[PDB]
């Protein structure tokens, strides 16, 4: 089947409980993690899935393991503190990819971004140059917005996305009362 590692980064800021969008969509994207981890489990049960947030003091909630029975429990007690942290959020997983058991598992990291990015374009091109340098599959998922959706993140992805053939895809969700599961499951990354 498919031998690859899955890393998800969820936001724990207070920007995920606003009443305009879904009713505390944290549970909705939790069900998204559930359907992508159970979908990858149905495709290849040997894939390991890690859990970590993007707070100031990043904490590894669950080590990379195919056993999601305790991951379902670890998805709770999100500790809604902090706002956003991007640099050590990338470096806390992309550098931790070397701690996986199976060396044949490809590198794939996703992230749920629910807060505006605090890093300037220089950090975007330095981190995009680092991720394109080490050649890690990066899927950017941006939930919620305050300013325009993609102004510098467009060039961030275009400069970050190498290997144009069957490479990485960008997930941009527009506002809407519909669920996010079917909207993020539309690309080829899910399934």
């Amino acid at each position: 089947m498919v031998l690859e590692s899955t890393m998800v980064c969820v936001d724990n800021s207070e920007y995920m409980r606003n009443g305009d969008f879904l009713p505390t969509r944290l549970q909705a994207q939790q069900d998204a993690v559930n359907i992508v981890c159970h979908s990858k489990t149905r495709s290849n049960p040997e894939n390991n899935v890690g859990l970590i947030t993007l707070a100031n003091d990043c904490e590894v909630l669950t080590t990379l393991t195919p056993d999601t029975g305790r991951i379902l429990s670890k998805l709770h007690t999100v500790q809604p503190k902090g706002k956003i942290t991007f640099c050590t959020g990338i470096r806390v997983a992309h550098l931790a990819l070397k701690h996986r058991q199976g060396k044949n598992h490809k590198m794939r990291i996703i992230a749920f971004v629910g807060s505006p990015v605090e890093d300037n374009e220089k950090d975007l091109v330095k981190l995009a140059k680092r991720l394109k340098k080490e050649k890690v599959n990066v899927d950017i998922i941006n939930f919620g917005e305050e300013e325009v959706n993609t102004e510098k993140l467009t060039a961030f992805v275009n400069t970050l996305n190498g290997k144009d053939g069957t490479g990485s895809h960008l997930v941009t969700v527009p506002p809407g009362p519909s669920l996010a599961d079917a909207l993020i499951s539309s690309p080829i990354l899910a399934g």
């Binding site: 207070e14 409980r17 009443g19 305009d20 305050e146």
Partner: protein, 374 residues
């Protein structure tokens, strides 16, 4: 009430629609955090405090049933409600209503009890307010040492400093206020009185012997250059030692209120500084001394030097016991506690001398000792 809010929201004063445009846009967008930031922007602006009585209750209810944003903003805006209304009768029901409303998610009880005690620190009650202040400092001694809540605790120690009962605690918390300052963003025009009552409070502080901790930090000596140097001069003389009595006399009679009764105790405090400086000046070369330097530096008679050294031993800063027959002054361990540069350079001299002497003895004994014994 959302469709019913557009009427009183749109209708406002002449300049209010400037913030009511983005306020109603963020209100229709239902962004509770941006709405909260706009509320803090409206409260932070120097409003006329005339037509805000409606938005205080409206945003009070919204902040009540929103159950999303940190209710500390509600604590601040309700401090502005009780500050604008000046009604302490309903303040207990309002703050208690916030206590009943705020669930057990974040430890905000330190700021809730801080606001309650702060409002109760008026002439109505003092003792129970001091007890609940001790409860505030007693509750949370955990890792969140942001010290901002503890800086408001320093404000409560200032309202407690309004009482002449205890001056020592305001200095102990005033060291924490000395160490918790981040930048000069807060108005310097207030820092004039902050350093004024901070210097006078440090002088009147009877729970400390040396003043070098206050003057040692550069933020105070850098924030006192604008003010008149009549206090910096007497703080440098009180720190570095009072060899004369004319300057300390003119500044001892310069501050008229509350300094007459405390003047004698301040003399009993500064009479030990010449002792610690006269015993830490000469580290070696006949440390033994006589009472002539004490009586000459303190312009006191020979009959009172026994009570002077008896008080010096009663304070506990010195352990000196003199086995003399004819009057002599032998001293022991003492702490400078402020600074000594000639003792830093002399520390390097005597330290390097000790090091090269130990090295000389090691090479001397080990030289032939290693060759004959190994």
């Amino acid at each position: 009430d959302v469709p019913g809010f557009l009427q009183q929201s749109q209708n406002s004063g002449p300049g209010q629609p400037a913030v009511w445009h983005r306020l109603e846009e963020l209100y229709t967008k239902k962004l509770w955090h941006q709405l909260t930031l706009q509320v803090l922007d409206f409260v932070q602006d120097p409003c006329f405090a005339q037509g805000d009585g409606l938005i205080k209750l409206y945003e009070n209810f919204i902040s009540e049933f929103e159950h999303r944003v940190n209710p500390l903003s509600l604590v601040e805006i309700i401090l502005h409600v009780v500050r604008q209304m000046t009604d302490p009768n309903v303040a207990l029901t309002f703050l208690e209503k916030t206590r009943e409303k705020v669930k057990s998610s974040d430890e905000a009880v330190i700021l809730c009890k801080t606001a309650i005690g702060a409002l109760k620190l008026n002439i109505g009650d003092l003792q129970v307010t001091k007890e609940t202040i001790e409860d505030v400092e007693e509750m949370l001694n955990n890792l969140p040492g942001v010290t901002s809540v503890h800086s408001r605790f320093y404000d409560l120690s200032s309202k407690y400093y309004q009482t002449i009962g205890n001056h020592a605690s305001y200095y102990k918390d005033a060291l924490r206020f000395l160490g918790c300052v981040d930048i000069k963003d807060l108005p310097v025009s207030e820092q004039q009185e902050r350093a004024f009552t901070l210097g006078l409070a440090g002088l009147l502080g009877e729970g400390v012997f040396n003043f070098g901790e206050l003057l040692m930090h550069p933020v105070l000596e850098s924030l006192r250059n604008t003010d008149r140097q009549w206090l910096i001069d007497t703080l440098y003389a009180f720190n570095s030692g009072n060899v004369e009595r004319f300057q300390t006399l003119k500044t001892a009679w310069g501050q008229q209120p509350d300094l007459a009764a405390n003047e004698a105790q301040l003399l009993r405090k500064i009479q030990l500084l010449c002792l610690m400086e006269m015993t830490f000046t000469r580290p070696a070369n006949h440390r033994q001394l006589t009472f002539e330097e004490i009586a000459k530096s303190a312009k006191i008679t020979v009959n009172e030097v026994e009570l002077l050294v008896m008080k010096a031993l009663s304070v506990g800063l010195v352990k000196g016991s003199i086995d003399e027959v004819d009057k002599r002054v032998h001293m022991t361990w003492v702490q400078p506690r402020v600074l000594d540069l000639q003792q830093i350079k002399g520390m390097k001299d005597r330290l390097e001398f000790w090091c090269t002497d130990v090295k000389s003895m090691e090479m001397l004994v080990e030289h032939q000792a290693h060759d004959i014994l190994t």
